[PDB]
Structure formats: C-alpha cells, structure tokens
Amino acid sequence: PLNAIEPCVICQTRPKNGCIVHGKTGHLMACFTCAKKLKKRNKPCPVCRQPIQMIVLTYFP
Amino acid sequence: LPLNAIEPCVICQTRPKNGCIVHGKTGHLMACFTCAKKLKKRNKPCPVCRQPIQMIVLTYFP
Ligand SMILES: [Cl-]
Ligand SMILES: [Cl-]
Ligand SMILES: [Zn+2]
Ligand SMILES: [Zn+2]
Ligand SMILES: [Zn+2]
Ligand SMILES: [Zn+2]
C-alpha cells in the first residue's frame, strides 16, 4: 500500500496514524488529530460513510 | 511518516500490513489480517507489546 507512507489526506501534514474503525474494518487515510475531530463531531467515515466506532492511534512497529 | 508501513507482514513475510492489532485506544500494525487473525483466534497477546488483543481490524488505505 504505497499511500500508507503519504501524509493525512485532510491536513496534508501529519502521518496516517488515526485509523477510523467500524466493526472489523478500518480506513486509514488521516492522522489521529484529524480523525479524532471527525469522531468528536460524530461525522461518518469520509470514504465509506459507515459510522466511526472508534479512532485507533496506529503504530507501525 | 511510517516508511516501514509498505514492508510485508513480519510473520509470513508475504502479505501487506493490513491486520491492525487493537488494544485500548492504540494499534500495532506489523502483520497481515490472516496472521493477526490466527493470533486472535488462538487468544495470543500483541506480539510487540503483549497487551491482550481486543480485536483485529482489516485496515484499508484509501
Ligand atoms: Cl475514539
Ligand atoms: Cl477480532
Ligand atoms: Zn490530519
Ligand atoms: Zn470507512
Ligand atoms: Zn502475515
Ligand atoms: Zn501491541
């Protein structure tokens, strides 16, 4: 996934570490800060429009 | 920026890192969904932090 290393598609600054979770699937295209704002404002997933169940701060060990 | 995100699953060394191991509010992404599901199914902890595995999230990269 060559886009995994590109910046947050919302702020184009921070890395993609704000995983938007819904059930057993996640869309990772946004930083924790950007993804938390969406959760806080009760917005859906930007790409699939499923509700945001949680934000997971994603590390690549 | 996490340049290691595009390296393969550290377990099978084949499939991409799309098996996010979730525990509390954090996730360790270093394994494919297949490999991460086997760990969860067999009730193993997170390979790198040993926290219990709450869930595996099949991670897509829009
Ligand atoms: Cl959250
Ligand atoms: Cl699971
Ligand atoms: Zn952002
Ligand atoms: Zn989504
Ligand atoms: Zn694997
Ligand atoms: Zn862990």
mmCIF file of N, CA and C and ligand atoms in Angstrom:
data_model
loop_
_atom_site.group_PDB
_atom_site.id
_atom_site.type_symbol
_atom_site.label_atom_id
_atom_site.label_comp_id
_atom_site.label_asym_id
_atom_site.label_seq_id
_atom_site.Cartn_x
_atom_site.Cartn_y
_atom_site.Cartn_z
ATOM 1 N N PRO A 1 0.806 -1.249 0.000
ATOM 2 C CA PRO A 1 0.000 0.000 0.000
ATOM 3 C C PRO A 1 0.838 1.299 0.000
ATOM 4 N N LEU A 2 1.327 1.759 -1.177
ATOM 5 C CA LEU A 2 2.258 2.922 -1.308
ATOM 6 C C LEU A 2 1.689 4.217 -0.688
ATOM 7 N N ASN A 3 0.373 4.355 -0.520
ATOM 8 C CA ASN A 3 -0.259 5.554 0.108
ATOM 9 C C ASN A 3 -0.129 5.540 1.637
ATOM 10 N N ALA A 4 0.225 4.398 2.241
ATOM 11 C CA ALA A 4 0.355 4.252 3.715
ATOM 12 C C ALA A 4 1.386 5.260 4.254
ATOM 13 N N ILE A 5 2.375 5.633 3.422
ATOM 14 C CA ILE A 5 3.537 6.480 3.828
ATOM 15 C C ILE A 5 3.303 7.951 3.452
ATOM 16 N N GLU A 6 2.199 8.274 2.777
ATOM 17 C CA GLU A 6 1.849 9.670 2.388
ATOM 18 C C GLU A 6 1.154 10.355 3.557
ATOM 19 N N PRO A 7 1.118 11.702 3.615
ATOM 20 C CA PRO A 7 0.525 12.392 4.754
ATOM 21 C C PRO A 7 -1.013 12.277 4.796
ATOM 22 N N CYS A 8 -1.556 12.503 5.981
ATOM 23 C CA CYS A 8 -3.000 12.709 6.227
ATOM 24 C C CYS A 8 -3.654 13.458 5.053
ATOM 25 N N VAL A 9 -4.666 12.877 4.406
ATOM 26 C CA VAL A 9 -5.345 13.472 3.210
ATOM 27 C C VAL A 9 -6.145 14.716 3.613
ATOM 28 N N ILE A 10 -6.382 14.943 4.902
ATOM 29 C CA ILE A 10 -7.198 16.098 5.397
ATOM 30 C C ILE A 10 -6.312 17.328 5.661
ATOM 31 N N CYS A 11 -5.227 17.176 6.419
ATOM 32 C CA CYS A 11 -4.326 18.292 6.824
ATOM 33 C C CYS A 11 -3.061 18.323 5.944
ATOM 34 N N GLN A 12 -2.786 17.241 5.212
ATOM 35 C CA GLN A 12 -1.571 17.048 4.365
ATOM 36 C C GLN A 12 -0.264 17.362 5.117
ATOM 37 N N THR A 13 -0.222 17.149 6.434
ATOM 38 C CA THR A 13 0.958 17.408 7.304
ATOM 39 C C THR A 13 1.359 16.132 8.053
ATOM 40 N N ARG A 14 0.517 15.708 9.000
ATOM 41 C CA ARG A 14 0.810 14.620 9.962
ATOM 42 C C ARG A 14 0.720 13.275 9.255
ATOM 43 N N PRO A 15 1.360 12.226 9.802
ATOM 44 C CA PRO A 15 1.295 10.902 9.179
ATOM 45 C C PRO A 15 -0.081 10.223 9.345
ATOM 46 N N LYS A 16 -0.355 9.203 8.531
ATOM 47 C CA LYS A 16 -1.588 8.388 8.620
ATOM 48 C C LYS A 16 -1.515 7.446 9.831
ATOM 49 N N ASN A 17 -1.904 7.932 11.013
ATOM 50 C CA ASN A 17 -1.880 7.148 12.280
ATOM 51 C C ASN A 17 -3.227 7.204 13.025
ATOM 52 N N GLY A 18 -4.268 7.789 12.437
ATOM 53 C CA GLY A 18 -5.625 7.861 13.009
ATOM 54 C C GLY A 18 -6.540 6.892 12.284
ATOM 55 N N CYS A 19 -6.511 5.614 12.664
ATOM 56 C CA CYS A 19 -7.304 4.580 11.974
ATOM 57 C C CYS A 19 -8.760 4.760 12.368
ATOM 58 N N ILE A 20 -9.623 4.922 11.372
ATOM 59 C CA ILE A 20 -11.093 5.038 11.582
ATOM 60 C C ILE A 20 -11.657 3.642 11.539
ATOM 61 N N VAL A 21 -12.145 3.137 12.673
ATOM 62 C CA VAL A 21 -12.604 1.724 12.832
ATOM 63 C C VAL A 21 -14.137 1.691 12.750
ATOM 64 N N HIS A 22 -14.684 0.654 12.125
ATOM 65 C CA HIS A 22 -16.143 0.378 12.049
ATOM 66 C C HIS A 22 -16.279 -1.133 11.911
ATOM 67 N N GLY A 23 -16.692 -1.806 12.991
ATOM 68 C CA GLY A 23 -16.800 -3.274 13.023
ATOM 69 C C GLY A 23 -15.401 -3.867 13.043
ATOM 70 N N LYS A 24 -15.072 -4.726 12.085
ATOM 71 C CA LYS A 24 -13.740 -5.377 11.950
ATOM 72 C C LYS A 24 -12.966 -4.772 10.775
ATOM 73 N N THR A 25 -13.374 -3.616 10.253
ATOM 74 C CA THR A 25 -12.633 -2.954 9.150
ATOM 75 C C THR A 25 -12.264 -1.539 9.580
ATOM 76 N N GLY A 26 -11.257 -0.980 8.918
ATOM 77 C CA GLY A 26 -10.738 0.371 9.196
ATOM 78 C C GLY A 26 -10.303 1.047 7.915
ATOM 79 N N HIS A 27 -10.571 2.346 7.789
ATOM 80 C CA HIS A 27 -9.979 3.208 6.726
ATOM 81 C C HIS A 27 -8.901 4.062 7.383
ATOM 82 N N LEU A 28 -7.653 3.878 6.957
ATOM 83 C CA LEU A 28 -6.500 4.675 7.452
ATOM 84 C C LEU A 28 -6.013 5.601 6.338
ATOM 85 N N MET A 29 -6.392 6.877 6.404
ATOM 86 C CA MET A 29 -6.008 7.903 5.406
ATOM 87 C C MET A 29 -5.825 9.255 6.101
ATOM 88 N N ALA A 30 -5.897 9.281 7.422
ATOM 89 C CA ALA A 30 -5.970 10.503 8.231
ATOM 90 C C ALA A 30 -5.137 10.300 9.492
ATOM 91 N N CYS A 31 -4.566 11.398 9.980
ATOM 92 C CA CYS A 31 -3.814 11.475 11.250
ATOM 93 C C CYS A 31 -4.801 11.364 12.409
ATOM 94 N N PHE A 32 -4.278 11.055 13.591
ATOM 95 C CA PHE A 32 -5.080 10.901 14.827
ATOM 96 C C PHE A 32 -5.886 12.191 15.095
ATOM 97 N N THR A 33 -5.243 13.343 15.008
ATOM 98 C CA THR A 33 -5.851 14.675 15.273
ATOM 99 C C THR A 33 -7.064 14.865 14.366
ATOM 100 N N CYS A 34 -6.878 14.717 13.054
ATOM 101 C CA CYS A 34 -7.964 14.917 12.064
ATOM 102 C C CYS A 34 -9.084 13.894 12.330
ATOM 103 N N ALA A 35 -8.737 12.627 12.537
ATOM 104 C CA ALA A 35 -9.724 11.538 12.716
ATOM 105 C C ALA A 35 -10.491 11.724 14.027
ATOM 106 N N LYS A 36 -9.836 12.216 15.076
ATOM 107 C CA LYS A 36 -10.489 12.487 16.396
ATOM 108 C C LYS A 36 -11.512 13.630 16.264
ATOM 109 N N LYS A 37 -11.195 14.680 15.504
ATOM 110 C CA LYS A 37 -12.142 15.799 15.265
ATOM 111 C C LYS A 37 -13.420 15.218 14.647
ATOM 112 N N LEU A 38 -13.288 14.317 13.670
ATOM 113 C CA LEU A 38 -14.452 13.714 12.974
ATOM 114 C C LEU A 38 -15.278 12.927 13.994
ATOM 115 N N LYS A 39 -14.612 12.110 14.810
ATOM 116 C CA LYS A 39 -15.284 11.300 15.859
ATOM 117 C C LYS A 39 -16.032 12.235 16.821
ATOM 118 N N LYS A 40 -15.318 13.227 17.366
ATOM 119 C CA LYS A 40 -15.839 14.224 18.343
ATOM 120 C C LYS A 40 -17.106 14.881 17.772
ATOM 121 N N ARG A 41 -17.096 15.279 16.494
ATOM 122 C CA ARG A 41 -18.261 15.914 15.826
ATOM 123 C C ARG A 41 -19.243 14.861 15.298
ATOM 124 N N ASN A 42 -19.047 13.578 15.622
ATOM 125 C CA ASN A 42 -19.964 12.465 15.245
ATOM 126 C C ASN A 42 -20.188 12.451 13.729
ATOM 127 N N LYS A 43 -19.123 12.641 12.956
ATOM 128 C CA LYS A 43 -19.157 12.524 11.483
ATOM 129 C C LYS A 43 -18.936 11.072 11.097
ATOM 130 N N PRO A 44 -19.381 10.665 9.891
ATOM 131 C CA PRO A 44 -19.121 9.320 9.405
ATOM 132 C C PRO A 44 -17.678 9.167 8.898
ATOM 133 N N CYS A 45 -17.314 7.944 8.530
ATOM 134 C CA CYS A 45 -16.051 7.657 7.801
ATOM 135 C C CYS A 45 -16.057 8.465 6.500
ATOM 136 N N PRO A 46 -15.043 9.323 6.230
ATOM 137 C CA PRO A 46 -15.019 10.106 4.986
ATOM 138 C C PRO A 46 -15.093 9.311 3.677
ATOM 139 N N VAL A 47 -14.614 8.070 3.626
ATOM 140 C CA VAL A 47 -14.558 7.353 2.311
ATOM 141 C C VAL A 47 -15.678 6.311 2.180
ATOM 142 N N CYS A 48 -16.205 5.760 3.289
ATOM 143 C CA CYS A 48 -17.225 4.683 3.233
ATOM 144 C C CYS A 48 -18.558 5.122 3.861
ATOM 145 N N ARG A 49 -18.579 6.235 4.607
ATOM 146 C CA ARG A 49 -19.778 6.788 5.283
ATOM 147 C C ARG A 49 -20.385 5.825 6.331
ATOM 148 N N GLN A 50 -19.712 4.755 6.754
ATOM 149 C CA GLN A 50 -20.171 3.967 7.935
ATOM 150 C C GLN A 50 -19.881 4.813 9.172
ATOM 151 N N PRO A 51 -20.635 4.681 10.285
ATOM 152 C CA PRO A 51 -20.345 5.459 11.495
ATOM 153 C C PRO A 51 -18.938 5.165 12.035
ATOM 154 N N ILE A 52 -18.303 6.126 12.709
ATOM 155 C CA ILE A 52 -16.950 5.887 13.290
ATOM 156 C C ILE A 52 -17.114 5.278 14.680
ATOM 157 N N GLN A 53 -16.814 3.984 14.813
ATOM 158 C CA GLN A 53 -16.963 3.247 16.096
ATOM 159 C C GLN A 53 -15.876 3.714 17.063
ATOM 160 N N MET A 54 -14.644 3.852 16.585
ATOM 161 C CA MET A 54 -13.528 4.392 17.398
ATOM 162 C C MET A 54 -12.408 4.862 16.481
ATOM 163 N N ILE A 55 -11.573 5.749 17.006
ATOM 164 C CA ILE A 55 -10.250 6.080 16.422
ATOM 165 C C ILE A 55 -9.196 5.264 17.172
ATOM 166 N N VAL A 56 -8.298 4.634 16.425
ATOM 167 C CA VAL A 56 -7.163 3.853 16.967
ATOM 168 C C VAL A 56 -5.885 4.566 16.536
ATOM 169 N N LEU A 57 -5.103 5.010 17.516
ATOM 170 C CA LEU A 57 -3.760 5.564 17.259
ATOM 171 C C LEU A 57 -2.875 4.406 16.776
ATOM 172 N N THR A 58 -2.483 4.441 15.509
ATOM 173 C CA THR A 58 -1.894 3.277 14.798
ATOM 174 C C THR A 58 -0.379 3.459 14.749
ATOM 175 N N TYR A 59 0.337 2.509 15.320
ATOM 176 C CA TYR A 59 1.813 2.406 15.262
ATOM 177 C C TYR A 59 2.160 1.333 14.242
ATOM 178 N N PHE A 60 3.298 1.499 13.572
ATOM 179 C CA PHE A 60 3.900 0.507 12.658
ATOM 180 C C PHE A 60 5.211 0.007 13.270
ATOM 181 N N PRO A 61 5.136 -0.933 14.239
ATOM 182 C CA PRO A 61 6.335 -1.408 14.939
ATOM 183 C C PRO A 61 7.363 -2.061 14.004
ATOM 184 N N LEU B 1 6.568 10.205 9.257
ATOM 185 C CA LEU B 1 5.960 9.322 8.184
ATOM 186 C C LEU B 1 6.475 7.883 8.317
ATOM 187 N N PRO B 2 5.583 6.862 8.313
ATOM 188 C CA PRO B 2 5.992 5.493 8.642
ATOM 189 C C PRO B 2 6.440 4.647 7.431
ATOM 190 N N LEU B 3 7.687 4.836 6.955
ATOM 191 C CA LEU B 3 8.213 4.243 5.689
ATOM 192 C C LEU B 3 8.188 2.699 5.744
ATOM 193 N N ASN B 4 8.158 2.089 6.936
ATOM 194 C CA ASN B 4 8.113 0.608 7.112
ATOM 195 C C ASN B 4 6.694 0.054 6.888
ATOM 196 N N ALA B 5 5.673 0.916 6.792
ATOM 197 C CA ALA B 5 4.259 0.513 6.579
ATOM 198 C C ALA B 5 4.111 -0.335 5.308
ATOM 199 N N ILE B 6 4.988 -0.164 4.310
ATOM 200 C CA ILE B 6 4.893 -0.825 2.964
ATOM 201 C C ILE B 6 5.754 -2.093 2.915
ATOM 202 N N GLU B 7 6.451 -2.438 4.000
ATOM 203 C CA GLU B 7 7.152 -3.742 4.123
ATOM 204 C C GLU B 7 6.135 -4.821 4.470
ATOM 205 N N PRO B 8 6.426 -6.091 4.132
ATOM 206 C CA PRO B 8 5.461 -7.152 4.338
ATOM 207 C C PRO B 8 5.318 -7.537 5.812
ATOM 208 N N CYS B 9 4.207 -8.196 6.092
ATOM 209 C CA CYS B 9 3.901 -8.871 7.373
ATOM 210 C C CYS B 9 5.174 -9.502 7.949
ATOM 211 N N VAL B 10 5.524 -9.150 9.193
ATOM 212 C CA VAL B 10 6.774 -9.644 9.856
ATOM 213 C C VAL B 10 6.639 -11.142 10.187
ATOM 214 N N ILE B 11 5.429 -11.705 10.145
ATOM 215 C CA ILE B 11 5.199 -13.152 10.439
ATOM 216 C C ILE B 11 5.360 -14.015 9.175
ATOM 217 N N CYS B 12 4.630 -13.711 8.110
ATOM 218 C CA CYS B 12 4.600 -14.556 6.878
ATOM 219 C C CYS B 12 5.552 -13.995 5.804
ATOM 220 N N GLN B 13 6.008 -12.747 5.977
ATOM 221 C CA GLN B 13 6.967 -12.034 5.082
ATOM 222 C C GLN B 13 6.443 -11.981 3.645
ATOM 223 N N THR B 14 5.112 -12.035 3.445
ATOM 224 C CA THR B 14 4.456 -12.071 2.112
ATOM 225 C C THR B 14 3.390 -10.975 2.002
ATOM 226 N N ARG B 15 2.308 -11.091 2.780
ATOM 227 C CA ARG B 15 1.102 -10.232 2.639
ATOM 228 C C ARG B 15 1.387 -8.862 3.253
ATOM 229 N N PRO B 16 0.673 -7.808 2.811
ATOM 230 C CA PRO B 16 0.879 -6.475 3.350
ATOM 231 C C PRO B 16 0.397 -6.322 4.802
ATOM 232 N N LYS B 17 0.885 -5.273 5.480
ATOM 233 C CA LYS B 17 0.474 -4.952 6.862
ATOM 234 C C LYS B 17 -0.932 -4.347 6.832
ATOM 235 N N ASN B 18 -1.976 -5.187 6.883
ATOM 236 C CA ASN B 18 -3.413 -4.760 6.912
ATOM 237 C C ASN B 18 -4.194 -5.411 8.069
ATOM 238 N N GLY B 19 -3.519 -6.110 8.967
ATOM 239 C CA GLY B 19 -4.106 -6.734 10.164
ATOM 240 C C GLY B 19 -3.753 -5.926 11.395
ATOM 241 N N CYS B 20 -4.490 -4.840 11.654
ATOM 242 C CA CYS B 20 -4.191 -3.967 12.801
ATOM 243 C C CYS B 20 -4.619 -4.679 14.090
ATOM 244 N N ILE B 21 -3.688 -4.846 15.012
ATOM 245 C CA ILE B 21 -3.927 -5.465 16.344
ATOM 246 C C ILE B 21 -4.305 -4.345 17.288
ATOM 247 N N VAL B 22 -5.564 -4.311 17.723
ATOM 248 C CA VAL B 22 -6.103 -3.199 18.545
ATOM 249 C C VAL B 22 -6.108 -3.622 20.019
ATOM 250 N N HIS B 23 -5.761 -2.699 20.895
ATOM 251 C CA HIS B 23 -5.757 -2.864 22.373
ATOM 252 C C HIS B 23 -5.958 -1.483 23.012
ATOM 253 N N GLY B 24 -7.065 -1.272 23.721
ATOM 254 C CA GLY B 24 -7.419 0.067 24.214
ATOM 255 C C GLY B 24 -7.577 0.983 23.016
ATOM 256 N N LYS B 25 -6.854 2.097 22.997
ATOM 257 C CA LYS B 25 -7.009 3.196 22.006
ATOM 258 C C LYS B 25 -5.836 3.195 21.025
ATOM 259 N N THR B 26 -4.994 2.170 21.046
ATOM 260 C CA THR B 26 -3.807 2.074 20.178
ATOM 261 C C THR B 26 -3.906 0.775 19.388
ATOM 262 N N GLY B 27 -3.119 0.731 18.318
ATOM 263 C CA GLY B 27 -2.967 -0.432 17.433
ATOM 264 C C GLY B 27 -1.528 -0.596 17.008
ATOM 265 N N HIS B 28 -1.035 -1.834 17.025
ATOM 266 C CA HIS B 28 0.253 -2.241 16.417
ATOM 267 C C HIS B 28 -0.058 -2.882 15.072
ATOM 268 N N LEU B 29 0.371 -2.221 13.997
ATOM 269 C CA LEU B 29 0.202 -2.711 12.609
ATOM 270 C C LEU B 29 1.564 -3.172 12.080
ATOM 271 N N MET B 30 1.823 -4.482 12.109
ATOM 272 C CA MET B 30 3.080 -5.092 11.605
ATOM 273 C C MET B 30 2.798 -6.475 11.022
ATOM 274 N N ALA B 31 1.527 -6.825 10.894
ATOM 275 C CA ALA B 31 1.085 -8.176 10.489
ATOM 276 C C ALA B 31 -0.087 -8.030 9.528
ATOM 277 N N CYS B 32 -0.223 -8.999 8.624
ATOM 278 C CA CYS B 32 -1.370 -9.112 7.695
ATOM 279 C C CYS B 32 -2.601 -9.583 8.479
ATOM 280 N N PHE B 33 -3.788 -9.403 7.914
ATOM 281 C CA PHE B 33 -5.074 -9.783 8.545
ATOM 282 C C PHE B 33 -5.076 -11.286 8.882
ATOM 283 N N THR B 34 -4.653 -12.128 7.947
ATOM 284 C CA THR B 34 -4.591 -13.603 8.107
ATOM 285 C C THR B 34 -3.762 -13.941 9.346
ATOM 286 N N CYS B 35 -2.533 -13.435 9.407
ATOM 287 C CA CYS B 35 -1.593 -13.755 10.503
ATOM 288 C C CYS B 35 -2.164 -13.190 11.809
ATOM 289 N N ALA B 36 -2.670 -11.953 11.801
ATOM 290 C CA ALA B 36 -3.179 -11.291 13.028
ATOM 291 C C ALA B 36 -4.433 -12.017 13.536
ATOM 292 N N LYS B 37 -5.263 -12.539 12.631
ATOM 293 C CA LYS B 37 -6.498 -13.304 12.987
ATOM 294 C C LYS B 37 -6.138 -14.619 13.676
ATOM 295 N N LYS B 38 -5.098 -15.300 13.197
ATOM 296 C CA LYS B 38 -4.632 -16.562 13.806
ATOM 297 C C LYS B 38 -4.289 -16.265 15.262
ATOM 298 N N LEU B 39 -3.543 -15.184 15.524
ATOM 299 C CA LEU B 39 -3.135 -14.821 16.913
ATOM 300 C C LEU B 39 -4.393 -14.621 17.765
ATOM 301 N N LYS B 40 -5.355 -13.852 17.254
ATOM 302 C CA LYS B 40 -6.605 -13.540 17.989
ATOM 303 C C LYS B 40 -7.372 -14.839 18.275
ATOM 304 N N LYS B 41 -7.608 -15.641 17.243
ATOM 305 C CA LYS B 41 -8.333 -16.942 17.311
ATOM 306 C C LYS B 41 -7.698 -17.808 18.407
ATOM 307 N N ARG B 42 -6.371 -17.902 18.452
ATOM 308 C CA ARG B 42 -5.635 -18.730 19.437
ATOM 309 C C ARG B 42 -5.400 -17.937 20.729
ATOM 310 N N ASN B 43 -6.038 -16.772 20.881
ATOM 311 C CA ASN B 43 -6.065 -15.972 22.127
ATOM 312 C C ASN B 43 -4.628 -15.633 22.575
ATOM 313 N N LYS B 44 -3.759 -15.271 21.637
ATOM 314 C CA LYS B 44 -2.389 -14.787 21.940
ATOM 315 C C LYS B 44 -2.452 -13.289 22.167
ATOM 316 N N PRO B 45 -1.473 -12.705 22.882
ATOM 317 C CA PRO B 45 -1.398 -11.262 23.023
ATOM 318 C C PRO B 45 -0.748 -10.590 21.810
ATOM 319 N N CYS B 46 -0.657 -9.267 21.855
ATOM 320 C CA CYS B 46 0.059 -8.463 20.829
ATOM 321 C C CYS B 46 1.511 -8.947 20.791
ATOM 322 N N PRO B 47 2.058 -9.396 19.635
ATOM 323 C CA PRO B 47 3.467 -9.760 19.541
ATOM 324 C C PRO B 47 4.493 -8.715 20.022
ATOM 325 N N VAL B 48 4.232 -7.403 19.930
ATOM 326 C CA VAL B 48 5.313 -6.415 20.256
ATOM 327 C C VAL B 48 5.120 -5.775 21.635
ATOM 328 N N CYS B 49 3.904 -5.769 22.187
ATOM 329 C CA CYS B 49 3.598 -5.059 23.468
ATOM 330 C C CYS B 49 2.958 -6.012 24.491
ATOM 331 N N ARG B 50 2.543 -7.217 24.080
ATOM 332 C CA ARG B 50 1.909 -8.251 24.941
ATOM 333 C C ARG B 50 0.598 -7.769 25.588
ATOM 334 N N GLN B 51 0.004 -6.648 25.179
ATOM 335 C CA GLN B 51 -1.347 -6.288 25.686
ATOM 336 C C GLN B 51 -2.323 -7.294 25.075
ATOM 337 N N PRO B 52 -3.447 -7.643 25.760
ATOM 338 C CA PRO B 52 -4.429 -8.554 25.179
ATOM 339 C C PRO B 52 -4.952 -7.984 23.849
ATOM 340 N N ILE B 53 -5.302 -8.856 22.906
ATOM 341 C CA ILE B 53 -5.842 -8.392 21.607
ATOM 342 C C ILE B 53 -7.355 -8.224 21.769
ATOM 343 N N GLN B 54 -7.799 -6.980 21.743
ATOM 344 C CA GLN B 54 -9.234 -6.623 21.809
ATOM 345 C C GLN B 54 -9.894 -7.040 20.494
ATOM 346 N N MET B 55 -9.278 -6.721 19.354
ATOM 347 C CA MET B 55 -9.853 -7.024 18.023
ATOM 348 C C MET B 55 -8.773 -6.902 16.953
ATOM 349 N N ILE B 56 -8.968 -7.608 15.843
ATOM 350 C CA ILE B 56 -8.208 -7.378 14.588
ATOM 351 C C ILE B 56 -9.081 -6.532 13.676
ATOM 352 N N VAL B 57 -8.498 -5.482 13.118
ATOM 353 C CA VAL B 57 -9.164 -4.577 12.154
ATOM 354 C C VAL B 57 -8.463 -4.742 10.812
ATOM 355 N N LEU B 58 -9.216 -5.224 9.824
ATOM 356 C CA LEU B 58 -8.761 -5.292 8.422
ATOM 357 C C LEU B 58 -8.639 -3.838 7.967
ATOM 358 N N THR B 59 -7.407 -3.378 7.792
ATOM 359 C CA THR B 59 -7.077 -1.956 7.559
ATOM 360 C C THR B 59 -6.924 -1.723 6.058
ATOM 361 N N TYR B 60 -7.760 -0.844 5.515
ATOM 362 C CA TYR B 60 -7.717 -0.390 4.111
ATOM 363 C C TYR B 60 -7.033 0.975 4.079
ATOM 364 N N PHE B 61 -6.347 1.280 2.992
ATOM 365 C CA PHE B 61 -5.571 2.544 2.849
ATOM 366 C C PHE B 61 -6.139 3.331 1.679
ATOM 367 N N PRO B 62 -7.227 4.116 1.890
ATOM 368 C CA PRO B 62 -7.826 4.915 0.813
ATOM 369 C C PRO B 62 -6.821 5.840 0.117
HETATM 370 CL CL CL C 1 -12.388 7.299 19.706
HETATM 371 CL CL CL C 2 -11.285 -9.766 16.095
HETATM 372 ZN ZN ZN C 3 -4.534 15.334 9.614
HETATM 373 ZN ZN ZN C 4 -14.585 3.670 6.443
HETATM 374 ZN ZN ZN C 5 1.200 -12.485 7.500
HETATM 375 ZN ZN ZN C 6 0.569 -4.066 20.699
#
